[PDB]
Short mmCIF file of C-alpha atoms in Angstrom, two decimals:
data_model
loop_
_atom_site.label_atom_id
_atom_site.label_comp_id
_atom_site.label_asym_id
_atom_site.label_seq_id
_atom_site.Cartn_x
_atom_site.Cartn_y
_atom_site.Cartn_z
CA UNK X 1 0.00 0.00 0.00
CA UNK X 2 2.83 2.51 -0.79
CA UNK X 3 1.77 3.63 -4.26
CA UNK X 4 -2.26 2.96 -3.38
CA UNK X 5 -3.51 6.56 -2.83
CA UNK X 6 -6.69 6.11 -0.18
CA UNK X 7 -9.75 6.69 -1.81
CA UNK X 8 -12.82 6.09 1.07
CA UNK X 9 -11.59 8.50 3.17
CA UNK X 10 -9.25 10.22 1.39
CA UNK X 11 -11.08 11.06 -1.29
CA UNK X 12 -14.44 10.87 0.60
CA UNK X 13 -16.45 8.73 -1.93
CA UNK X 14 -19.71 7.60 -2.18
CA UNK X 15 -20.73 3.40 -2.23
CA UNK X 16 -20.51 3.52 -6.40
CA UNK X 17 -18.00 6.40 -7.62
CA UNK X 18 -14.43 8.34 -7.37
CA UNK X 19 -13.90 11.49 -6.78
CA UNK X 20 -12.71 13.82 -9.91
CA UNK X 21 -9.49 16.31 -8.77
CA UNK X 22 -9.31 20.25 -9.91
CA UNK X 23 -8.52 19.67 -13.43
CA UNK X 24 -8.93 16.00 -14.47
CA UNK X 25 -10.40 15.27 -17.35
CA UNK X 26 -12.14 12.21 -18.21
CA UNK X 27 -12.25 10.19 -21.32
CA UNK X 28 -13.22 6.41 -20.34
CA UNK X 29 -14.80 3.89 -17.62
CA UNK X 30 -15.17 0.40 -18.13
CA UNK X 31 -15.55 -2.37 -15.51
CA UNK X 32 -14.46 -5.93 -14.56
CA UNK X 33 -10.56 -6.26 -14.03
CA UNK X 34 -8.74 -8.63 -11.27
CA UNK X 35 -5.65 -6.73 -9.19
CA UNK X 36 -3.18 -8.51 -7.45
CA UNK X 37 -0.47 -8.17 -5.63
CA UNK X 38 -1.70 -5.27 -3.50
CA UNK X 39 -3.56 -5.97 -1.24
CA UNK X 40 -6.71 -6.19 -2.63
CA UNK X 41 -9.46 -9.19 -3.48
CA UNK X 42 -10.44 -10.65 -6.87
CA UNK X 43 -12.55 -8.30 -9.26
CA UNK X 44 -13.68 -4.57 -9.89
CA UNK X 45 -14.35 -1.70 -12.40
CA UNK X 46 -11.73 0.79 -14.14
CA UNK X 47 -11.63 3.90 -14.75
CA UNK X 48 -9.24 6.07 -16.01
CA UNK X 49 -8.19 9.94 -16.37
CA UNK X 50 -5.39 12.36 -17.34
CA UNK X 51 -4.12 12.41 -13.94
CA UNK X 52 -5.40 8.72 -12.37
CA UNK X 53 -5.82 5.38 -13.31
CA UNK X 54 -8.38 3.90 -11.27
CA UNK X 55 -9.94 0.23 -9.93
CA UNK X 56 -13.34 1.09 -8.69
CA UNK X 57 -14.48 -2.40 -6.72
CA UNK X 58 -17.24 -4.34 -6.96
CA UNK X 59 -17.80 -6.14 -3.20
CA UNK X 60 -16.42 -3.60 -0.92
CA UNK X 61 -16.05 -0.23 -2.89
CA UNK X 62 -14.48 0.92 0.62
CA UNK X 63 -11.37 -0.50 -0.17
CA UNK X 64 -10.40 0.81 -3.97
CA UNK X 65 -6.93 1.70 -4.62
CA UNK X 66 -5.05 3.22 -7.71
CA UNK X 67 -2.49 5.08 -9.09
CA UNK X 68 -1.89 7.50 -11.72
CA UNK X 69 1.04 8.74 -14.42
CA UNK X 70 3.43 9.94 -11.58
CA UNK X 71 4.66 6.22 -11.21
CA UNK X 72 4.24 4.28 -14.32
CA UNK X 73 7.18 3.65 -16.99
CA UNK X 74 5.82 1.97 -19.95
CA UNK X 75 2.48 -0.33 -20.89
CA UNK X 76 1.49 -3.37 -23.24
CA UNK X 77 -0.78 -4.96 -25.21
CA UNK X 78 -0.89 -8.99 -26.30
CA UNK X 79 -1.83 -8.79 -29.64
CA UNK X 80 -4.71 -8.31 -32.02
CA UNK X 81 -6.86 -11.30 -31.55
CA UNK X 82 -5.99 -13.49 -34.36
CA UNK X 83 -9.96 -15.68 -34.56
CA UNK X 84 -12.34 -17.67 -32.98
CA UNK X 85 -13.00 -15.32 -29.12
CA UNK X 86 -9.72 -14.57 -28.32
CA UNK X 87 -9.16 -10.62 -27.07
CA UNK X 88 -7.13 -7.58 -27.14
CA UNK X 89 -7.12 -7.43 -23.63
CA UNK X 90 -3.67 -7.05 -21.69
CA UNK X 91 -2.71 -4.15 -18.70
CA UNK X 92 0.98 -4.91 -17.70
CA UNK X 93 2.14 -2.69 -15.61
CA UNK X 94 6.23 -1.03 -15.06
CA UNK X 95 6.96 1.01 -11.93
CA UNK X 96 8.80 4.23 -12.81
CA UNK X 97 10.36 3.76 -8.99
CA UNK X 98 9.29 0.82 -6.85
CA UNK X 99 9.80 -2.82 -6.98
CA UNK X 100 5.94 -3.49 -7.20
CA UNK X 101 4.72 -5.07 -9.84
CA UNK X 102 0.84 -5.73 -11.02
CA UNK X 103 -1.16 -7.37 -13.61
CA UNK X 104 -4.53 -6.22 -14.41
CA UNK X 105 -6.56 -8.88 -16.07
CA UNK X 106 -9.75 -7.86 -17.16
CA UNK X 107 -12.36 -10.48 -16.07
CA UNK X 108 -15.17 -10.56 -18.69
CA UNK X 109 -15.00 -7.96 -21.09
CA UNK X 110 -15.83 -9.02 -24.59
CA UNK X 111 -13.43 -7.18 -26.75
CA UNK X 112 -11.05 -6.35 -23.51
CA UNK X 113 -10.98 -2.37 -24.88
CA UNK X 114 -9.08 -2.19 -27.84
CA UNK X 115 -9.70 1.39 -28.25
CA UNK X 116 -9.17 2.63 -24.82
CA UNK X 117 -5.75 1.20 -25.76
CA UNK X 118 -5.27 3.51 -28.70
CA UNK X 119 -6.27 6.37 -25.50
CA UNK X 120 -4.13 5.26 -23.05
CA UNK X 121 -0.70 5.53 -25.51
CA UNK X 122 -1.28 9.11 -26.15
CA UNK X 123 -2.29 10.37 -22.15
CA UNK X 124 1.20 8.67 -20.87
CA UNK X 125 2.41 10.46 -23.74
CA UNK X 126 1.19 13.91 -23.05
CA UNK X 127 2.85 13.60 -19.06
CA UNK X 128 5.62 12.49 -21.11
CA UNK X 129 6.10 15.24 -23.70
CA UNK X 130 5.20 17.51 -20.64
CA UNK X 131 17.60 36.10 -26.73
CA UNK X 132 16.15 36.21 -23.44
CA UNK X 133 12.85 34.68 -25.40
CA UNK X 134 11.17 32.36 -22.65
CA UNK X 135 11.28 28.90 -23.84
CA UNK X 136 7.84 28.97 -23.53
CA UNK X 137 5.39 26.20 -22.25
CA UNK X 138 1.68 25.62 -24.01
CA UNK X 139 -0.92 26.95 -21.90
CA UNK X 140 0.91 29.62 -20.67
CA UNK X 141 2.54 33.38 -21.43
CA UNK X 142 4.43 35.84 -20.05
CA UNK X 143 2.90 38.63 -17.86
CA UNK X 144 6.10 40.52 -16.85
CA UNK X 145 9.34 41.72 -18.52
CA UNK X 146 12.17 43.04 -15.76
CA UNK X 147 15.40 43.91 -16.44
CA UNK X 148 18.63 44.45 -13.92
CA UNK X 149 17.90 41.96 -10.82
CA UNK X 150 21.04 40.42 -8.53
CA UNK X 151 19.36 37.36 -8.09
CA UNK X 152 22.20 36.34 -5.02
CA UNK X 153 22.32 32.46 -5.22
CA UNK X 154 24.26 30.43 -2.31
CA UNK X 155 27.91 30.78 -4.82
CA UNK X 156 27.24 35.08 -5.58
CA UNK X 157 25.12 37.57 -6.77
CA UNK X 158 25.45 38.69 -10.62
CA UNK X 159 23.40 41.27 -13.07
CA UNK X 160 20.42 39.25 -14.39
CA UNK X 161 17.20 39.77 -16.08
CA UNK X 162 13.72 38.33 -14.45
CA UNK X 163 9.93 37.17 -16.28
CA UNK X 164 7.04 36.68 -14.30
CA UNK X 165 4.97 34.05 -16.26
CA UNK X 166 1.70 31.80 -15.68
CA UNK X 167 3.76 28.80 -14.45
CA UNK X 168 7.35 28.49 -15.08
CA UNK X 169 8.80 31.76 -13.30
CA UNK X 170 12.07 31.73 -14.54
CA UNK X 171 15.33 34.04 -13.95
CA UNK X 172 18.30 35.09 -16.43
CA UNK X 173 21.26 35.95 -16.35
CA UNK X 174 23.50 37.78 -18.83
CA UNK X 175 27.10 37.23 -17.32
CA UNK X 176 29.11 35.51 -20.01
CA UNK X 177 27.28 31.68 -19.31
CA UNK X 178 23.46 32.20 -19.91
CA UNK X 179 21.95 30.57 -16.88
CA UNK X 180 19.02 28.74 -16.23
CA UNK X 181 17.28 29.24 -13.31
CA UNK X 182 13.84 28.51 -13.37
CA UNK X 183 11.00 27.33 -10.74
CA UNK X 184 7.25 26.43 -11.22
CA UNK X 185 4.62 28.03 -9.62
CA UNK X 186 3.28 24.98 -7.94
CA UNK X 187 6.75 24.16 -6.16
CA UNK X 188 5.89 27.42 -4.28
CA UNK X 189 4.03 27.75 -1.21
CA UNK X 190 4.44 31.15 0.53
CA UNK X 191 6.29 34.25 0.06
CA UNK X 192 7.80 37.12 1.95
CA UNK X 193 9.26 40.21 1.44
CA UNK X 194 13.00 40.91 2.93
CA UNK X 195 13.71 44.81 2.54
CA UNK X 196 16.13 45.19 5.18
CA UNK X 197 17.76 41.22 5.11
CA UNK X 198 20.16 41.95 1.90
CA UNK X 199 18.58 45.01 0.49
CA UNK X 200 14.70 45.08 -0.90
CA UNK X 201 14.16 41.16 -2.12
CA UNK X 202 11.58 38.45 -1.86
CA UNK X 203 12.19 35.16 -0.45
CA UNK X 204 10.56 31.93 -1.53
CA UNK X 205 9.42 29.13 0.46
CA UNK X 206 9.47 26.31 -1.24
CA UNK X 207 7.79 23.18 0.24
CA UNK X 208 9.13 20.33 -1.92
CA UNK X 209 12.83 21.17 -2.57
CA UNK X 210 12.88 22.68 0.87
CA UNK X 211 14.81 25.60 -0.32
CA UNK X 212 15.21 29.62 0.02
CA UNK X 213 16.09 31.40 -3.87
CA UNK X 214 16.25 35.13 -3.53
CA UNK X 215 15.90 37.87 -5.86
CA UNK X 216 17.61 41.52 -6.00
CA UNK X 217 15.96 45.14 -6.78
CA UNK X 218 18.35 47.16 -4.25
CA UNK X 219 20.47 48.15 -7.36
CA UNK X 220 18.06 51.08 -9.10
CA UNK X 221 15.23 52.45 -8.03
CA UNK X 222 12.28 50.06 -9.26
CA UNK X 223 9.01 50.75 -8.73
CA UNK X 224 8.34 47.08 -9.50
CA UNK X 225 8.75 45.14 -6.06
CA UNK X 226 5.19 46.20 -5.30
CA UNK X 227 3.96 45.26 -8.60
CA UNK X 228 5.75 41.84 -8.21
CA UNK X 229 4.10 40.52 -4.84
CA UNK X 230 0.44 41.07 -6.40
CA UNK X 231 0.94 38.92 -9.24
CA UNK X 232 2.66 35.99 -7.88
CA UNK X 233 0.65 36.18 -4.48
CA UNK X 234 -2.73 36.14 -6.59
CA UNK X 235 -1.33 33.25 -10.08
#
């Protein structure tokens, strides 16, 4: 139960259904599969997402477990079925970082979703594929444009030139190397504002990396250290 997110209480669910995240789209739902090697019965539904990849039960729906694209390396099928009611049918299953292994063995579906095959290729896919131009994600644009900020990193300080974007907020610098320094949006939890502690920055609290980066506006008078905490505070 180490890659089983909890699902009755955890995601608060009813006797029949999941519960969808912020953001996950759906595309199909189909129904009896056998699990094993978790730690789990005989026989349930699946459903699956852009984020999730899900056993629904069928005896005690109070105990459903899953997992989603974070975790999974690469996926089969058997083979087109040659004649004569054989099936498309195979879920084998690769661990991106645990020594678990499954098999999902759909129980008595007729054509074992061929089709949900030719989905399921092309949504690992997607979390796969994921002069100071931005190399710019889809879904997302740039909202800022600073120049001259002494980003001061753990090694030094050095002249550098910031973007505040949807996502990606990024930093550059243009001392003789072209550095990238860049961190998501979602990697950061809080803020706050150091004037005095090394002259008029912000400070980032990250909560996965568990890390401070720092920023520098000290050097000319800015006007844009006020205009920076609305817009990362509110995206």
């Amino acid at each position: 139960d180490a890659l089983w997110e909890d699902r009755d209480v955890r995601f608060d669910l009813s006797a029949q259904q999941m519960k969808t995240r912020p953001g996950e789209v759906l595309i199909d739902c189909l129904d009896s599969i056998e699990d094993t090697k978790g730690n789990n019965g005989d026989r349930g539904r699946l459903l699956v997402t852009n984020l999730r990849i899900l056993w629904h039960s069928l005896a005690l729906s109070r105990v459903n477990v899953s997992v989603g694209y974070n975790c999974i390396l690469n996926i089969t099928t058997r083979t087109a079925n040659s004649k004569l009611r054989g099936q498309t049918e195979a879920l084998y299953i690769l661990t991106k970082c645990n020594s678990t292994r499954f098999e999902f063995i759909f129980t008595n579906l007729v054509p074992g979703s061929p089709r949900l095959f030719t989905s399921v290729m092309a949504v690992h896919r997607a979390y796969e594929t994921s002069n100071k131009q931005l190399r710019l994600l889809p879904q997302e644009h740039v909202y800022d444009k600073i120049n001259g900020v002494w980003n001061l990193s753990s090694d030094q300080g050095n002249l550098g030139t910031f973007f505040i974007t949807n996502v990606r907020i990024v930093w550059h610098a243009n001392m003789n190397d072209s550095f990238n320094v860049s961190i998501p949006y979602l990697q950061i939890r809080s803020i706050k504002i150091r004037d005095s502690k090394f002259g008029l920055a912000l400070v980032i609290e990250s909560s996965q990396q568990s890390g401070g980066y720092v920023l520098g506006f000290k050097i000319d008078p800015v006007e844009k250290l006020q205009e920076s905490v609305k817009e990362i505070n509110s995206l």
